[PDB]
Design a protein around this ligand. Structure first.
Ligand SMILES: Cc1cc2c3c(c1C)C(C)(C)C[C@@H](O)N3c1c(nc(O)[nH]c1=O)N2C[C@H](O)[C@H](O)[C@H](O)COP(=O)(O)O
Ligand SMILES: Cc1cc2c3c(c1C)C(C)(C)C[C@@H](O)N3c1c(nc(O)[nH]c1=O)N2C[C@H](O)[C@H](O)[C@H](O)COP(=O)(O)O
Ligand SMILES: O=C(O)c1ccc2ccccc2c1
Ligand SMILES: O=C(O)c1ccc2ccccc2c1
Ligand SMILES: [K+]
Ligand SMILES: [K+]
Ligand SMILES: [K+]
Ligand SMILES: [K+]
Ligand SMILES: [Mn+2]
Ligand SMILES: [Mn+2]
Lengths: 500, 500
């Protein structure tokens, strides 16, 4: 079963890539697994597979850390992401984001129901499991709980049955048979939760599947549109209908090769303590516990020798940056295009802690618009910051065609040199804000509103007659024949491999 | 004669450091020398010494490129700067900037006049030189002239004799016996020029010395205070009185071991075309020629086998960033301290194209002030942006004690996560602006005014009770004994030298 369609095959692919370290000696889920993983993420090392996790019982569970983090080499930097998608390991960001967007104007390929799969190899009922007795990691020393859920997919369906959403949202163990987690607007898990709360009749049927098809966890991390069932989007992207099995205790359907499945309900009434958690912006605020959503677990099913993926998130670079940031940028690119804005590319610079998105402008098309910075900034900000895809992003940086937005150095150069503070910016105070950014939820203003800006790093002639500069760099300030001569004589003269 | 006191000795020091490439085959001053130098600066390679420069005649001249640029290794990144100052080549930025500030509360050590020196080994009068016949470089393909002056020091004295200023300002060849160059407010060359213009009696006696003592070219690049003679500041910093010889045609004094000296006048009446030039922010605007100051050259004196230093400036990283940016940051640190502001460190992030300065705050002292972000931002911005030392800097970023301002990654993290756009910022429109930044002189607003901001990346509790977070990183979110265990078992488990 191919790597992008089966998590167990994906692990084998990483091994074969020489992108995995198998740790076969005992590792403590209390901080040690996550510390190793954090170090990996901070240094772009190989993914750790913890095959011998202190507290693993009857097959639950091994851990794979850093499943979507970066590789050290430039040439296959994004290779772990590529392996989620059947792309060559040398794929560019552009190619990865194009693959993730490709299903947006394709017919869905709905899933196929099969009678069984590996995720049914073992089961534990209501009398046989205790979530506090599993080797659930403590990921950061100040976390408010053991965060079992950092890289599984929540499965919830609208009351009318027409939309089944797959998404990543964190959750931690509350007690032997409950989790608490983030369920916040405008996220689809929250939107569906609200539909069940308005109906008022029952708690939300729920499942949480860990170790799902890698192409599915990518779509789980992406803000594809409201009402769109991720399973059929993944089917179209991959060209293959996903095989799903029914849950035992409800009528939801989970990927047949899921490593571990929890089945139960998301309460429409109950809450419990949730957090704090060491989060994507790089911080934890110890003791900042709040009420979160509360999930009841009725059943666990799992593969033999089940593997739990884990994201040890925080400072650069992990899945929150590589997947949540980049996939939000991809959706923003499409949203802009669909609103007739001349955007060619979008990326959330890692340097920005994925709080910015740089938007590359087709300045030929911009010039034909016969507009101004003030007007264009307002138009872009209204599109993006009024939409869910713009939720997590607080600064949009408009750049012209010379800038590669996938290169943070070049984005920082353009921002720093082409956008006059204040004058070339528009502030947005009456939009939804992202409270997890420290300057929002722990800042001087409203946690949930405002704090957003469009920063125009287009130069004035880019709106009118065309770029009127050349860069003072090797590439642009010397003729081709001289540049080539310099490069050809470089080592001969005494100065100093692409793969490495 | 030591490296920091004698340019010829400094060249030997770079050779001995294995930080020099001697090119002994013919190199064209038309773009080729500067292209090689640009490539060096973009890749942190060894400094190029062009010993065989097409058009060199009777000893004028060899070129040393990249004299103050970066080395590839982290461990001796700033070693070329250290060699300007007698510091070990492993010196930190902090140590370099402390050395440059050290003379600010020392008695000056005035210079010593000696009867002769190497700079008098050869001479060319008014009938014997033609600046258009020298191997003056074309540094960028669109430059408006051949920029002879990128790393010499202009020498001008107040009419009353009490202040002799040394500074770097660009200049290009106008004709056989004149240069044009930038002389702009608030720079000291401009301030002194204005004094002579108000007196109205004569042109400004002037000299331009190339290949000066490295400690002198560092002070030439720093905004030490108005009225302070750089020679005595360098004397105090180094503990040694600098040896100066009189010019032949005027009563100014030049370093005895200067490689090349031009003597003449800076006109109080005449201008000529100047620029465009590929500038420190990374751009050239072809055809953007303006009137600049006009210098008349009456005499050249030079060392046997004279060496002209050259800065091939533009995109990262060259002398404009390493020296002008960092030295302005150093002066800003002191200025803040002298104004009773609790600033411990300042640096101009390279990522910002040295348009930002990050100011590290002693938050214990800030808490005792019992102030607010709005108040404190205004106070800092009023100090810095109303002073010459703040001229080139458009964004100040306030950070707390956990941030190393000499690490751009950490500055970008703090800025992106701790400063709410708009609310946590104060815009300054009624301050002098730096017109060379593209968004100023080629932007949407006044070239010379405004466009400045204080961005407060202090979190709210840093003003009150203290930092209330821990970082979600390896360092802060795991206990010491676990971190050490992970590091000790890192290679054993299968994961992957300081000098490299
Ligand atoms: C890749 C990834 C994404 C997310 C998260 C993580 C990872 C690894 C955690 C490590 C678990 C940290 C957690 O903060 N987290 C998270 C989260 N979204 C939330 O509402 N709540 C969360 O707790 N997203 C982002 C969401 O996955 C995307 O916003 C997606 O678009 C949502 O799907 P949908 O609502 O659009 O269907
Ligand atoms: C290190 C360095 C500094 C400068 C420059 C260069 C280098 C290499 C050039 C490559 C030649 C580019 C040129 O744009 N340039 C330059 C310049 N200052 C100007 O007024 N004019 C200039 O043309 N400074 C900065 C000044 O040297 C400092 O601002 C110093 O503080 C001035 O001295 P003072 O007025 O404070 O005495
Ligand atoms: O707990 C987090 O780190 C996290 C990460 C990304 C998130 C994206 C959207 C909403 C909530 C999020 C929470
Ligand atoms: O020509 C330049 O690149 C340059 C560099 C730094 C400068 C600093 C202050 C004033 C003028 C300047 C000009
Ligand atoms: K999703
Ligand atoms: K702009
Ligand atoms: K100076
Ligand atoms: K702040
Ligand atoms: Mn969805
Ligand atoms: Mn001065």
């Amino acid at each position: 079963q191919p790597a992008h369609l089966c998590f167990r095959s994906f692990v084998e692919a990483l091994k074969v890539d020489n992108d995995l370290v198998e740790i076969n000696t005992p590792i403590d889920p209390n901080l040690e697994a996550a510390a190793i993983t954090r170090r990996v993420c901070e240094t772009n090392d190989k993914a750790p597979l913890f095959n011998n996790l202190i507290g693993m019982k009857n097959g639950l569970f091994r851990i794979l850390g850093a499943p979507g983090s970066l590789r050290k080499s430039s040439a296959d930097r994004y290779g772990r992401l590529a392996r989620h998608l059947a792309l060559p390991p040398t794929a560019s960001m552009r190619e990865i984001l194009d693959k993730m967007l490709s299903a947006s104007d394709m017919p869905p390929i709905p899933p196929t129901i099969v009678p069984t799969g590996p995720c049914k190899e073992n089961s534990l009922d209501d009398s046989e499991f205790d979530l506090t007795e599993l080797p659930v990691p403590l990921i950061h020393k100040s976390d408010g709980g053991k965060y079992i859920q950092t890289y599984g997919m929540h499965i919830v369906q609208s009351p009318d049955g027409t939309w089944t959403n797959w998404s990543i949202a964190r959750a931690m163990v509350h007690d032997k048979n409950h989790l608490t987690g983030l369920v916040i607007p405008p996220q689809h898990i929250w939107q569906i939760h609200q539909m069940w709360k308005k109906e008022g009749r029952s708690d939300v049927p729920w499942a949480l599947a860990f170790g799902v098809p890698p192409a599915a966890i990518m779509a789980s991390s992406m803000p594809i549109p409201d009402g769109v069932t991720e399973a059929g989007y993944v089917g179209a992207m991959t060209g293959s209908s996903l095989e799903l099995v029914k849950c035992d205790t409800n009528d939801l359907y989970v990927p047949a090769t899921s490593e571990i499945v929890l089945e139960g309900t998301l309460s429409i009434s109950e809450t419990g303590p949730e957090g704090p958690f060491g989060e994507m912006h790089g911080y934890i605020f110890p003791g900042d516990t709040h009420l979160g959503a509360k999930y009841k677990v009725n059943r666990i099913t799992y593969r033999n020798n089940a593997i739990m993926p884990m994201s040890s998130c925080g400072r650069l670079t992990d899945e929150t940056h590589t997947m949540s940031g980049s996939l939000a940028a991809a959706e923003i690119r499409k949203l802009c295009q669909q609103n007739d804005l001349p955007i060619t590319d979008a990326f959330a610079p890692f340097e920005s802690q994925v709080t910015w998105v740089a938007l590359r402008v087709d300045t030929e098309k911009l010039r034909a618009m016969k507009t101004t910075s003030e007007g264009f900034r307002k138009r872009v900000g209204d599109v993006v910051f009024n939409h869910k895809a713009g939720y997590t992003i607080h600064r949009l940086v408009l750049v012209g065609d010379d800038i590669d937005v996938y290169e943070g150095k070049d984005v920082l150069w353009a921002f720093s040199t082409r956008c006059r503070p204040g004058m070339d910016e528009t502030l947005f105070e009456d939009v939804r804000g992202f409270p997890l950014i420290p300057y929002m939820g722990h800042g001087n203003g409203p946690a949930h509103r405002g704090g957003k800006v469009v920063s125009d790093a287009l130069m004035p002639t880019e709106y009118t007659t065309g770029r009127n500069w050349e860069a003072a760099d090797f590439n642009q300030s010397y003729p081709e024949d001289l540049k080539q001569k310099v490069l050809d004589n470089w080592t001969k003269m005494g100065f100093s491999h692409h793969h490495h």
